[PDB]
Design an enzyme around this catalytic site. Sequence first.
Site, PDB file in Angstrom:
ATOM      1  N   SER B 358      -6.187-123.849  -2.130  1.00  0.00           N
ATOM      2  CA  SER B 358      -4.789-123.986  -1.769  1.00  0.00           C
ATOM      3  C   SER B 358      -4.240-122.885  -0.887  1.00  0.00           C
ATOM      4  CB  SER B 358      -4.021-123.984  -3.056  1.00  0.00           C
ATOM      5  OG  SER B 358      -4.136-122.738  -3.676  1.00  0.00           O
ATOM      6  N   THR B 359      -4.925-121.754  -0.864  1.00  0.00           N
ATOM      7  CA  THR B 359      -4.464-120.607  -0.120  1.00  0.00           C
ATOM      8  C   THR B 359      -5.195-120.374   1.189  1.00  0.00           C
ATOM      9  OG1 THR B 359      -5.915-119.115  -1.460  1.00  0.00           O
ATOM     10  CG2 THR B 359      -3.623-119.612  -2.236  1.00  0.00           C
TER      11      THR B 359
END
Lengths: 554, 554
Positions: B358-359
């Site tokens: 997600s990052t």
Amino acid sequence: MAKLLIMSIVSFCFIFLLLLFFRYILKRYFNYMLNYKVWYLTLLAGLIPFIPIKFIQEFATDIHKFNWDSIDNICTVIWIVLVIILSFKFLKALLYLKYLKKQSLYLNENEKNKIDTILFNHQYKKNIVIRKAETIQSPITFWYGKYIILIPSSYFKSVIDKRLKYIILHEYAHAKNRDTLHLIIFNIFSIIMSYNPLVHIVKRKIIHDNEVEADRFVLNNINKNEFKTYAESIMDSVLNVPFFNKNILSHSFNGKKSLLKRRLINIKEANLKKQSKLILIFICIFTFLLMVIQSQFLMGQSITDYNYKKPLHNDYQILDKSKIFGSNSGSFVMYSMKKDKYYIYNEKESRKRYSPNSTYKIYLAMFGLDRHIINDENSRMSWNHKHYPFDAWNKEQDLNTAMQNSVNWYFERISDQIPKNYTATQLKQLNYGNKNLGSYKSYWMEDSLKISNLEQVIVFKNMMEQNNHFSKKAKNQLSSSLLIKKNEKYELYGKTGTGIVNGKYNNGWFVGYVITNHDKYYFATHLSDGKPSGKNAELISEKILKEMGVLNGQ
Amino acid sequence: MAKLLIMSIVSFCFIFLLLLFFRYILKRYFNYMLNYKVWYLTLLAGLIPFIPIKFIQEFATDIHKFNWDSIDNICTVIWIVLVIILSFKFLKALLYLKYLKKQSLYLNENEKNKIDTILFNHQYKKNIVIRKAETIQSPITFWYGKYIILIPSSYFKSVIDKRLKYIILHEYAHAKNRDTLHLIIFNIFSIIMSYNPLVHIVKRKIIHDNEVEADRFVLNNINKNEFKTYAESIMDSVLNVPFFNKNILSHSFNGKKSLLKRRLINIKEANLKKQSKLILIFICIFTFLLMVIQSQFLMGQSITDYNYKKPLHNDYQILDKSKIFGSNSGSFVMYSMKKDKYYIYNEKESRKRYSPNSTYKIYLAMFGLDRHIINDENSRMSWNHKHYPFDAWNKEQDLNTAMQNSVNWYFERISDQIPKNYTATQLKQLNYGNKNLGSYKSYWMEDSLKISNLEQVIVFKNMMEQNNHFSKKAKNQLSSSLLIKKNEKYELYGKTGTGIVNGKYNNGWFVGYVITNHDKYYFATHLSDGKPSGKNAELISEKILKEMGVLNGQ
Ligand SMILES: [Zn+2]
Ligand SMILES: [Zn+2]
């Protein structure tokens, strides 16, 4: 990573096969042999890949994966056990040989005079040991670090046999060639490589070839005139006595089976006898019963995906709507409640049982309503705040929303809360296809429950007019939750959608009913070719329903 | 449906093994025999599983599938081909026999008188035929419903052999038993069952027993005084003549090989030829080269996921924030730009690499912006019209939207349009973990690219402040797109979310930076235990970041 052993097996085999290839050719055309030492190359090949010479909003989503590592963990344990076993077997044999060695005896002068007479013409280094024994029925030999040749004492007594000279030359060559040394070396390797059964094949080939080379040697030191005798004499060694294979780590004159040998043994032995017929009888009885037991559970064919075979119980007519389907080849069924008559397009296909996919929600909703998990006043279901593909699925839903927006989540919960026996009871009363609800919560989507278009029409019709084993409330909320479109000619109720696999539309459906200004219709459309989308199934149904007067009030 | 075939194999082997077991015991303990006809039971068992018995938005659901069907289609064709080949081979052997059937002659009166004398007291039905030919080096038999028995014309004249009597009884037994017919029958079946080798393997049990029974017939009719003679006769044939195996469909005295025979042959073949040493040399060379080619491509490892032991290029301290993580066991790293110092919580874990999930978008956005695939004036990407788990993704997005809602779709397009070489060059310059971008556009999500908490802190810090291989436009638009929270003390930039596999939350992240009224702080929080959600990683980070002065300016 077990796959890495598979890779070295493949390489090993490539080398093996190439070497094997040459072996064939060499002999086939020139009576040539490939020095067996070459086989050590496969052993090296067996470790190639083995040696690792590699020289704001919160996001959350589900990825499918398989864990194949637990399998390798299991395989690892097995390999360990196999090594333990194999190591033991090697040792067992070795211990025996050592124990035997300790019991051996040197030779006297005349015996030596004979041995020397036999081998003085080689003028070799006597760094090998010739001894005799009172155990073994025929000569054996084993390296150990001493090269010991043991000849049973009876062969010295029978010095007069002459042929002993062959025996001596034979063993001399085996000692010369260090055959049992190479054997144990390979055996260790084979023990280690528990993962590649081929190693036990190559060792056999090696042993055979080694024996052949010894024969050549021996013959090359014998006047050809005696070869007849020689062949007979050698052959006699496996005729005169039985063989045993205890000494798996060493060499002997008669240490292995053949079918011929078994026969000869069996012949020598007093084996002429009969048995009670009861033996066969019980075996065939029990074998039979097993076969029966297996039969009870072993069966099947492609037939599982087949169609509906029955004629209809109401009047019927065959339709041709192929112009409408166009590139989206499929099938279609309609039924007139007033006339008690079916109209079927492409009957052979319309009869095929297909997973109902999104159309099952019509029935599932009914089941949830009748069971009061959802009702009319409160038809809603909860969710778990995980993310879903449509906005409608990221909200709590009522039934009206859940049907029209095909909310799998809602319906997963509807399925989860309805007893399997209830579902099965209603699938049966409705005559719902194969009535199979599987074990999977979403059994209707590309899974176990299947129904044809003809059955889907028969079945939904039953849902509204013949099946009276549901409360009216369930029928009523379902009706409202199904409205798609209303106008001055009809009220179109139902639900469309598609079964999609690996991104390809394969099972497009549209199922429902129409309240018209003249009659009540039930229908089911299914598409398989072209682009059998949800909307296409819907549009195809509508064009047909317009031609049949259903959506025109005609 | 190959599975039904597999069931066949299983059924067969179950009966086979059961039966094989029983047979072992019978012989092993009592030398008992079971009529081989019992093997038909396995063939029959093999047929069991082949019995075909059972005795308003548009929606679709995308199901992943393994295609095993193409495999069965291909395999079916192969199975057909194998049957054709086997049929061919069978026929060719049969035609050979067809020829022989038209060649041999019956015998005269005295030879008949001899044979009748041999069988005089046996009083066997004589609806059999004995014939002779010059083509037979040793007698053969074939059924045809005629019991065709051939002998060498060469022994016709051998008025004193005293062997025919053994020959006749041996041959008789096979004729009596219709052994050939049974093998023909079995052959039909083994031709059919091209998929299960046991079907042919079992024939060898049959064949062996057939010979055993013939020996018994012979012995049963012999004054024991001569049993030894019979045994000698057997070996005499073995030694005396070569065998040929054209008659794969019938029985003979000398139609097969053995190790003994190979040796005897070699003795009789004075293949006194020289072989140049170049033979093994070149074979070994070529083998080596084969090994080389495989070697340059074959190499495994567990190493890929190995984390690092690397010391830092700036100051650092080790943290203990275990009472914040609590049940959500995880790890954490912070860095102070003004102090040039890292603070590392639970370093044994914070130094492990995990897919960034997600990052990754934080870094990917810098790259997309630098290459101007997305830029400041126009930061948008196109849509493929597919639905995704987030409402925010079911559209075209700009960068600011895409960053806050973790829009992989947007970012997958960004990944496709950034030369892999640029991405890789900076993953290397930034020390981005394993620097592996795989081959898939979505490489950051539970896939190939992996990075530790410590490394993400290092990477972002460098990417935005120390690394001058990216444009100012990229740095500025990225900073804007990353803002998540702020107040009068801090501005918090970053992103959170979790990688989920088969429904379980496995890799939760929160990654970012804070600009405060005092300093610039870089950080990353990762969770693995408890409920390692994105929000939890963020909340844990916030509790820690406040203690560490990150969110306050201390
Ligand atoms: Zn030998
Ligand atoms: Zn025979």
